[PDB]
Enzyme design. Sequence first.
Site, short mmCIF file in Angstrom:
data_model
loop_
_atom_site.label_atom_id
_atom_site.label_comp_id
_atom_site.label_asym_id
_atom_site.label_seq_id
_atom_site.Cartn_x
_atom_site.Cartn_y
_atom_site.Cartn_z
N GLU A 161 -0.17 2.39 2.87
CA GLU A 161 -0.11 1.17 3.68
C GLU A 161 -0.22 1.54 5.15
OE1 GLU A 161 3.16 -1.46 3.07
OE2 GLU A 161 2.95 -1.51 0.88
N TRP A 171 -3.09 -1.71 4.69
CA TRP A 171 -2.27 -2.75 4.08
C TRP A 171 -2.84 -4.05 4.51
CZ3 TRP A 171 0.58 -4.47 0.32
CH2 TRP A 171 1.01 -5.81 0.40
N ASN A 201 8.03 0.73 -4.56
CA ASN A 201 7.49 0.55 -3.22
C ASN A 201 8.62 0.36 -2.21
OD1 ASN A 201 5.16 -0.24 -1.27
ND2 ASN A 201 6.66 -1.90 -1.06
N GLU A 202 8.59 1.17 -1.16
CA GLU A 202 9.55 1.11 -0.07
C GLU A 202 11.01 0.87 -0.43
OE1 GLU A 202 8.24 -1.34 3.11
OE2 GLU A 202 6.19 -0.56 3.10
N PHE A 219 -2.02 -9.97 7.71
CA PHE A 219 -2.26 -8.52 7.71
C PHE A 219 -3.61 -8.12 7.12
CE2 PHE A 219 2.31 -8.05 8.39
CZ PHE A 219 2.44 -6.79 8.99
N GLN A 248 2.99 -11.16 -3.27
CA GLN A 248 2.32 -11.53 -2.04
C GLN A 248 0.93 -12.17 -2.17
OE1 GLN A 248 3.60 -7.56 -0.26
NE2 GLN A 248 3.74 -8.89 1.55
N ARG A 289 -5.11 -0.50 -4.27
CA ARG A 289 -3.72 -0.32 -4.65
C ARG A 289 -3.11 -1.71 -4.82
NH1 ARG A 289 1.34 0.11 -1.03
NH2 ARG A 289 2.95 0.43 -2.64
N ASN A 313 3.88 4.54 3.71
CA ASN A 313 3.52 3.24 4.27
C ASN A 313 3.93 3.32 5.73
OD1 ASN A 313 2.96 2.62 1.62
ND2 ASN A 313 4.61 1.11 1.38
N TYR A 343 3.49 2.03 9.79
CA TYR A 343 3.07 0.98 10.71
C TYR A 343 3.40 1.26 12.16
CZ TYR A 343 2.50 -1.87 6.52
OH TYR A 343 2.10 -2.36 5.30
N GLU A 394 3.88 -12.71 3.82
CA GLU A 394 4.65 -11.67 4.50
C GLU A 394 6.15 -11.92 4.43
OE1 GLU A 394 3.92 -8.86 5.21
OE2 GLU A 394 5.42 -8.13 6.63
N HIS A 401 7.35 -3.81 -7.00
CA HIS A 401 7.22 -4.09 -5.58
C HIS A 401 8.20 -5.21 -5.18
CE1 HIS A 401 5.35 -4.56 -1.65
NE2 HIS A 401 4.41 -3.68 -1.94
C1 LIG Z 1 11.28 -4.70 10.58
O1 LIG Z 1 10.67 -5.63 9.65
C2 LIG Z 1 9.90 -4.97 8.68
C3 LIG Z 1 9.76 -3.54 8.63
C4 LIG Z 1 8.96 -2.94 7.62
C5 LIG Z 1 8.31 -3.76 6.66
C6 LIG Z 1 8.45 -5.18 6.69
C7 LIG Z 1 9.25 -5.77 7.71
O2 LIG Z 1 7.82 -5.99 5.76
C8 LIG Z 1 6.52 -5.48 5.32
O3 LIG Z 1 5.57 -5.66 6.38
C9 LIG Z 1 6.59 -3.99 4.97
O4 LIG Z 1 5.85 -3.52 4.10
N1 LIG Z 1 7.49 -3.17 5.65
O5 LIG Z 1 7.57 -1.79 5.35
#
Ligand SMILES: COc1ccc2c(c1)O[C@@H](O)C(=O)N2O
Lengths: 491, 491, 491, 491
Positions: free
Chosen positions: C396, C444, C179-180, C460, C32, C90, C321, C323, C451, C134
Amino acid sequence: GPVFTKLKPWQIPKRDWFDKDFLFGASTSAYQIEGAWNEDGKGPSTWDHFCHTYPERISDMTNGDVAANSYHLYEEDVKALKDMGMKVYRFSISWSRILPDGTGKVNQAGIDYYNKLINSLIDNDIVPYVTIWHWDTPQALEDKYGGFLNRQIVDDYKQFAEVCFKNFGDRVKNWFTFNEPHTYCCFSYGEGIHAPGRCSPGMDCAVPEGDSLREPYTAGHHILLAHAEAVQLFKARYNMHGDSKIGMAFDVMGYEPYQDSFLDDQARERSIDYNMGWFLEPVVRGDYPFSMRSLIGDRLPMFTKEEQEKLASSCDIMGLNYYTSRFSKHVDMSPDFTPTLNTDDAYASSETTGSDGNDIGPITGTYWIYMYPKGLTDLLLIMKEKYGNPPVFITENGIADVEGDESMPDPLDDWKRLDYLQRHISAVKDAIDQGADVRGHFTWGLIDNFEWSLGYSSRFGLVYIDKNDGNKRKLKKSAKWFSKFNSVPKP
Amino acid sequence: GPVFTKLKPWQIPKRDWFDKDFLFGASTSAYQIEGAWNEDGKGPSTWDHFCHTYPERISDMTNGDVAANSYHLYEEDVKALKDMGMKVYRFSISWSRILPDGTGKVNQAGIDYYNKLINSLIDNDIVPYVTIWHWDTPQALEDKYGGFLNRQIVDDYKQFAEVCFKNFGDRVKNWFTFNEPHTYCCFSYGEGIHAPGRCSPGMDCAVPEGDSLREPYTAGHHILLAHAEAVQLFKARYNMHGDSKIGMAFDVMGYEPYQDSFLDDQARERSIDYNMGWFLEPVVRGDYPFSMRSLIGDRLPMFTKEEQEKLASSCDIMGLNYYTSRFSKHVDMSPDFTPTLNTDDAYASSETTGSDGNDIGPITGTYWIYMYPKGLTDLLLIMKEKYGNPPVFITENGIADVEGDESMPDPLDDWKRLDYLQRHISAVKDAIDQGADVRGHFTWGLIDNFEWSLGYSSRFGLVYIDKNDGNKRKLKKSAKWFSKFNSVPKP
Amino acid sequence: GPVFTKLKPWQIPKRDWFDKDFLFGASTSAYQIEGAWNEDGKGPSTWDHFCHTYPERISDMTNGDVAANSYHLYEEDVKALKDMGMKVYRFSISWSRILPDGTGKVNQAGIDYYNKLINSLIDNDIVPYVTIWHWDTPQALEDKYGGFLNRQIVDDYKQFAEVCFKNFGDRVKNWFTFNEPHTYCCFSYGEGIHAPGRCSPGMDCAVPEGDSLREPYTAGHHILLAHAEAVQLFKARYNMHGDSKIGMAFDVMGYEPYQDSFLDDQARERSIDYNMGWFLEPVVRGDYPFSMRSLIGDRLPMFTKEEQEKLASSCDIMGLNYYTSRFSKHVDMSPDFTPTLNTDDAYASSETTGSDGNDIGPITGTYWIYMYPKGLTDLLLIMKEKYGNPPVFITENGIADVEGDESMPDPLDDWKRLDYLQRHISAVKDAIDQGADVRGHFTWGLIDNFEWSLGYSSRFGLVYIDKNDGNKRKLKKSAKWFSKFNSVPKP
Amino acid sequence: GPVFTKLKPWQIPKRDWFDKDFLFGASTSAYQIEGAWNEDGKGPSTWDHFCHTYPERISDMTNGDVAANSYHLYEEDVKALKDMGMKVYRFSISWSRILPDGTGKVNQAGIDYYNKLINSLIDNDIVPYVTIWHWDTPQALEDKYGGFLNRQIVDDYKQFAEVCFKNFGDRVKNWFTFNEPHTYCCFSYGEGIHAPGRCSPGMDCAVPEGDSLREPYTAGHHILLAHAEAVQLFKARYNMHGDSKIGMAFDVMGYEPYQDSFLDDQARERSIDYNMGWFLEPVVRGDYPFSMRSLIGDRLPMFTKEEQEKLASSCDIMGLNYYTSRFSKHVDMSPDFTPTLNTDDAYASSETTGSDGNDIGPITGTYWIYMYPKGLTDLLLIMKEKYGNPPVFITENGIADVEGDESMPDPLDDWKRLDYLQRHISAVKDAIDQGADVRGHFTWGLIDNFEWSLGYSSRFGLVYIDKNDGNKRKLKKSAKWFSKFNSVPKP
Ligand SMILES: COc1ccc2c(c1)O[C@@H](O)C(=O)N2O
Ligand SMILES: COc1ccc2c(c1)O[C@@H](O)C(=O)N2O
Ligand SMILES: COc1ccc2c(c1)O[C@@H](O)C(=O)N2O
Ligand SMILES: COc1ccc2c(c1)O[C@@H](O)C(=O)N2O
């Protein structure tokens, strides 16, 4: 069989559960590990005498003549603490090794020994917490005037304490005057299973020439007076820098009402008063629990006005030696019940099984240790809510692996002890989360040692003592866990 | 031995603990007390057949041929209720006595019998709560199409229910369509210890020609469809005055997590879903618990849209038959575990002993009834908080005194049963105090009766049936307590 | 419009709300921000390949060829962290830059790059928290055996991790293996909107030649096995000093029941299990959530006994993480519903609007981020009460400012992002006040970056990247607030 | 669209949720249903005059000339109540029909009408709850001295009330002196949308010759004085048997703080004080809320010592007319804000949308009724905790189905109204469970009627009035539910 369920992995305590100031350590006592009972001028103690005169009174016919031989192998004890990453070592000073005759000439060899241990601990970044007396009375004083049954023990103890303060106070900053006064009075003068081994005529102990309804209280009263004198002296002349602390270590069992009824609720309070309050309340408010005075009366000595004032607030830190809990069952006052043992005075019988017929908790090895971590948290909250929330250290906590237990064939694979310890450490966390001022946890049994009337048949150590291989120290599974818990760098 | 602690006298419930509308009663079932199994045209039921063809399947080799002979001695049952001051009598109607061939010609002698019982109850100011089916299937239907394993049972049951509504609905205003569907499906088609006695090949039951992983669910599905049809008909044509109520009686055990961990918390929920939810959730929302569908899948029949709508809200009153509780222990899904019995589908084993090694509660006599009143209160609060707090009646509750129990030498001195009942009545009070809509408590066992696979070896009655003295009814200690509790005027 | 109410000034968090040990930082990932996708020997990753072969799959037709050009401008990233007073950074290590061919020869230029970044951070008193992977898989491995869909990825990842430990472990003491994993498996193999872009035939993704009901689980299973192997190796050979920690970072959404009913309460738990439990439960207890196994069955790989043991307790720190949140709406099991996407397996649809018709919270810019700080506090308490309260870092947290948003004309005036961050930092404080062991908060978006499928259309960052002015770093309003929050001395 | 989620079936209230004494009913008002506006000597009211002089002020250009023609068809209203099983009917007496000239000669035809209605209700086992005044002022008094803006209204109202007590008091035992004084003062003298239609010059109402900052308070003050006089007389001469009760019905909206901040918490209290306290506090303590006096000052009339004493404790029962809730948003006192409408005096704006941008609840049909049952429970608890927990009846509660609503094509299929009512009845249960002394629930809209300024475009009835088919009464879905709820015997 017996079914022993372990904690789930995510329920195991981590060091970070506690703050940076919290202290983890291990404990031992002089007679239980030192050995060299008659070496370099050391005089005999009441336990040397008890074992040597009534050897049959020890389960396996053993004694503390050699024990773990820590008098000579202390460096290995320090090494074990270091390997586990412990930050504190609680040990006791042998009165008879320091003052062979109880009073008089100090034995320099004795002083040199403890200085070596203390300096080694400090060199290894371990803080020494010292117990001045651990049932360790010089037989010279026992013979001269009956030891703790005579008022003279008060000043003699005071002078002994002063020798300790003067010689070790420059490095030792945390003290405990006495260890488990309740256990001591009950077993040494009540049931008589411990030195000097006295009980009422007709009872079964080494010397049934005492009085199980009076000697326990007389001894306890002198212990408290001795404590008061020692602390007064300490605060007046041995805490000039203001960074030293002195307290007492109490044996305590948790209690739950036998049956859900106000009667057992009252019984439970009497049990706590008798087990814990007997010695804790005096050091807090200057007098025994009201319940005890109302039931023991003339058999429980009265404190003078100045004595009560000296005793009140005479503890900087409170040590709690916790192992198990019991159900408290109410006993009515009637002509059908007549106290014969001091423990009868609480009018509350301690039961291992509750009203619903279930044991309070799983047996852990030795017959009296039923696992019930909840009991510890409850006691810690009582300290917080009732006695002013003073600084509290769990000065003893652990279990024994017993000789002959088929479910414990490998002495080093002590997963049971480990689970028990993890559960109690977690119980302490609970108390702290609830506001209790708990400052540390010291596992009883840095190393396997002499378990009094049960000899070496009971192993309480985190570290194994291989008696057949030169008393070699060998880390058990539990000890290895602490190394990981404390993040000890690996070789 | 076994230690059985009784409530303190001030903890014993008083009638005034409950409001004037609360109802105390006792329960029985047709096959368990009636006798006259082939009298006045009555046809054989699945239980007549089971006992007569596989007598060895009953512990003491007994059966319901005569039982307490209530077909002839019902007036004595009414007298016992009156003497105890009970306001409700929950009993069941024998399908095979009403419709000997399952369908077709109604047996007027059968109708006359129940009319006599109903009228006597009303003459004695006792309200009749009637269970339409109590494991009582006409063998004629078992032979014709496999009874509850065939869809035809749905309409046949419906017609039977209608006969009951038409003949007794003018006086009976409270009904239960089925009794303990979970118990029935599990034991009759899973383990096969109950009539018709079916289980999977290789298993030990009378007829190992079924499928313990499928027949239980097939039978249960038909029970629910039958219930839905009967209730629809009832509400449409037999509740014109709007004062009648119809529901179902569910067997339920309380559950506690085996070990304190989120896994056993989840297991506990699966246990409740399987024991209680299996039949309760369908009558509440119109479908089985999600947990069951996710684990049983294709073996658990799907409900059509209209069936789900008919089932949803199809209960005016909920009957809970509570006796004991168990610990729920999580079972992982893996190739090491393969369900063979329907109960395996919950992936939660029911344990009598918990993680700490203690039984859940004191045994009361028969092997499966461990006393744990807390379990009942918990279930009642689940009814309140989760299922909308519908009207709930404890339709069964009690214990058995067993043949051969040396601690129960006098069959009339049932102080244990009395204590158990007082504790559970108190548990109900607790639930009510917490908002649960509990409307009554019916002790299971108005009189000792045929305890299915255990025959007469288990006595559940408040009233003793002296089998060697003409089946005479004799009030036990518990029954006498109710007389006092209900303030029955004394002679 | 959309109405966006800000916190009252006295409700804004202050640094002192958290203890001295709490850590505030910012995060980024290699693909990224780095750029230099083919520089100094770097091999192509699955994302280089995805963007270069299916450019249309990125909203604005952009890619990570250059990004913020952090490969060359990292000193400016460090400067931005310093200017804001952040104590932690991070970032992730690009597998393809370290091992161009996935395995084999290490690219020294790659090692030199990260050493420069690490040393600069340390020189500036910033602690590096490193994410090993990642979504960054070397295309060489994708081509060779299908990357994460093949077991070979396990050992190859292990060797990559070891290269990182050996070269950077002397200074880096905190790691995240992956990661995720949930986001990755869902979007890369389920919907296929992320590299490698696979989905079931008939679906709309770059390569509809996979299986949306199986590939996501296969990839996730290998991720967990890879994690277990890497951690085992780390604890055995790369934590000799005992001061290093390794964990995983999980994408997590908060969930609220769609409608107040036990059904949506159950659905909510399934949503949490699927979103968070999928990867968290395995690293905690060694197996997937029971709910997933019961619904996915054969499509969810089984762990062997040793694998479960390796996985259990394989996380020192947990990264969350967070949001946004969603409402969880129950979906019944019936022939009317047939899973086609892996997300369908939870039988709980994620809704942005609740039963009362209201959105869960205010939209923040990008379509999927609805503001609901309560959701974070709830998840943190679940970590505390259910999973043992392990060390948790918010790895995040933040929002995006989107291209074309008329309510966001000045890219530096990000008062919305600032308010969102202040509210979530406050939400963390709430969790800590309630006992949750939260150790830090990493926003984050240290800087605006790529993105993924939305390209650079979503910003972001706390720090603006002026793409038309040499990728210059410009502090936004939010960044300036942190300077004040962290008491950075002013020039 | 608009999304309207219904309660789950097990969440629907059952009659037994409330005790036997709880009362369910329906309400109407004279001008809204009677018709016969000039029949049998009836004089014109302020509403007859308002509609006839300013017809354009009614949305659909309709009026109450005929309405539901209840003057002639009351037997059908009684039938509807009976068919639904309602136990109470709350209706109002038309002042102008009883005293055509406001004062003087009583119209016997008017007295005969109400006697017929009252006797029919009693013959059908329905209890009459009578509202003496429902915005129904005789135009004769409006013309003579300005109606409620003149002190003479006090004694004239008193004499009217006495006529009612003398003629109907022998059968009517529950009275409400006035209906919604706050609504009346605000809309009739503030905005002027209701009769007599007055507002400040420059504003848009029929007669902009008043003062929106003063007339509302003057009218309200006279209402309270009139109430005090009527109650004093009632208790002194018309409650000799001691079984009659008299109170007032208040319009009340629930309020939630717009944003979580102490400022909106204060604003919320001002909103409650203004909406509810304005008239409730005077009848409770004898004076207006302190907040109102501090903000309105000289524009809010002062009560004399004897008037305050007469007003204090002048309510036996409190009627709460609840429909919806609003968010309360703080307004600062500054030169930038100058009150022009009486509602401005609360310095708290009522918002339909909260700080997070979400409506308070789902719209139900008419523009001002947003569903928020929580608001009702909150108000009921305020009555309990703050105002002494007096007897409270929900005298009005319901929703409107509006002309032109495409989501409501069949006027009889009012499932929305039904769900709303079930939710609010459940909200009342919650309040009762929490200790609130709530005695009944009267749905507003026994039948569709004249909704003031909106004419017949808004239908609030449980029972449909077919205006094109002779004003025939037709039970809607909601009405049929009540028949079932109240267990009305079916034909
Ligand atoms: C629903 O679309 C998303 C849901 C979660 C994510 C995403 C897109 O892309 C990044 O923003 C991210 O780190 N996550 O966790
Ligand atoms: C019941 O027997 C004992 C009870 C308590 C103790 C004991 C023996 O000896 C040691 O283990 C000890 O330190 N205590 O406190
Ligand atoms: C485990 O064995 C049984 C469990 C439950 C029951 C049983 C036997 O038979 C009767 O006592 C009964 O009514 N139930 O519910
Ligand atoms: C905002 O418009 C209204 C607010 C409240 C009301 C109203 C109109 O007219 C009737 O529905 C009524 O009884 N009240 O209380």
